[PDB]
């Protein structure tokens, strides 16, 4: 598979959009979040929302939801077309009834529903989800907001893929060794404390072996002071497509 | 009286050169954002003006280009800043906006975070009274029509300025504006292109007379905008970013 980080940035970065990953995978583009940002970077990149086969929601936060509402209204009214939104189960409900309701309620053209603008496929935790031949999606409870639910994802039994994520010394270990993911890609705070964010310094802790196998993501405007000062781990580009090989 | 207006972003809702349409208005020291979209965080951060720096922000309706942005906001201000600014929302939308769009991001209950309040103070309106928010600034608001079922707003800015926000043309209720005193000048919804629906198109307000025409400046237009210089009768297009005054 192959991943292109339209944005990579932590929630109010200004130098880089909001940490949303375009996947591609045998043909098939799906969208990991879609921020506040999300259509202008889609639209900087020359990706028009048409060719986004599906979008997966891993939280619900400005920066990982802010853009649907955009991308439901110009799929419906300007294109005519159904792209699948694939929600957490936990998620499907407040997804809508208390975040994208608002706006995109339209009582009198009858789009009461979340179903009104995509074909919304509500997806098990802890189930592998072959979302088209040759792309699985496995979601992992991650911890981010105590209370709220929020996701990790492994991909193609290959990526593990963070989200929004508090940092796991044991999780991250036992992936590097068990033989489930080879790439993980993680969120990166640059400043301390930490919170509900896994921190550089909380990384640096890994062992080498983990530091191989991880880029860094979700960072803030600062990122370039650390350039070179991550260990072994690197810094998601943003907009440059990484292919991820076996 | 006076006041000044600097358009934060003169854009439509899907523009993609201009940022949302937002308005700081600023009167007797007092700063107002008028709605607080997805891109006023970044238009903002472009101006220089630091969030803090914003007494207040007033919503007209419940769209992303209009509300999507105030997540952002309430975050910086109580993690960051430890501040508290106003949220002003007209009564009919002050449960919509938490219930049906805030509350999923903002909604913290394991830290005591389960309403609006927590982050704002939040003041709500009612329609068709007059609110002085800040001795000197008066806000009235006027039910718009945008979408059908939907209650969105325009307001009256100190008897001086009517802001349409999103609006469907009125003809009759412009005209009234242009000669019952109780505006000079009016910043409208201009939709560049054909058929009308939900905002007022350009053809439409150049159906007005050109004493009216005189009156406004347009706004909330699309990325296509520097095409139709020249080309909207009396009427010009607001500079995004420009700060225009107002007087008398
Ligand atoms: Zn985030
Ligand atoms: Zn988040
Ligand atoms: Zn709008
Ligand atoms: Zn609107």
């Known amino acids: 598979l192959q991943i292109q980080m339209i944005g990579t940035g932590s929630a109010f ?15 098939f583009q799906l969208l990991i979040d879609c921020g506040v940002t999300a259509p202008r970077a889609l639209h900087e990149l020359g990706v028009p929302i048409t060719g986004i086969d599906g979008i997966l929601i891993t939280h619900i936060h ?6 649907i509402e955009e991308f439901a209204f110009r799929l419906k009214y300007k294109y005519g077309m159904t792209i699948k939104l694939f929600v ?6 407040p997804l809508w009834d208390h975040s994208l309701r608002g706006g995109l309620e339209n009582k009198a053209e009858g789009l009461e529903q979340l179903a009104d603008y995509f074909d919304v496929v509500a997806l098990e935790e802890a189930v592998v989800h072959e979302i088209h ?9 991650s911890q981010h907001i105590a209370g ?7 991909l193609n039994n290959l990526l593990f893929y963070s989200s929004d ?9 036992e992936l590097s060794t068990s033989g489930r993911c080879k ?19 909380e990384l640096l802790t890994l062992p080498e072996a983990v530091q191989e196998m991880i880029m860094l993501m979700h960072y803030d405007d600062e990122m370039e002071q650390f350039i070179g000062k991550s260990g072994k781990m ?3 580009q943003q907009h440059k497509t990484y292919s991820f090989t076996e």
Do not use: W
Not at 148 to 154: G, I, P, T, V
Not at 183 to 201: F, G, K, M, R, S
């Open 148 to 154: 709220k639910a929020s996701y990790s994802l492994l």
């Open 88 to 93: 957490p189960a936990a998620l499907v409900n």
């Open 234 to 236: 690197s810094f998601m």
């Open 183 to 201: 790439y993980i890609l993680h969120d990166c705070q640059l400043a301390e404390p930490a919170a509900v964010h896994a921190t550089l310094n």
């Open 133 to 141: 031949p040759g792309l699985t999606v496995e979601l992992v409870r």
């Open 62 to 67: 400005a920066d990982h939801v802010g853009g």
């Open 13 to 27: 970065a200004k130098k880089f959009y909001n940490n949303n990953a375009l996947v591609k995978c045998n043909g």
């Open 165 to 173: 994520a508090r940092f796991n010394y044991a999780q991250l270990v």
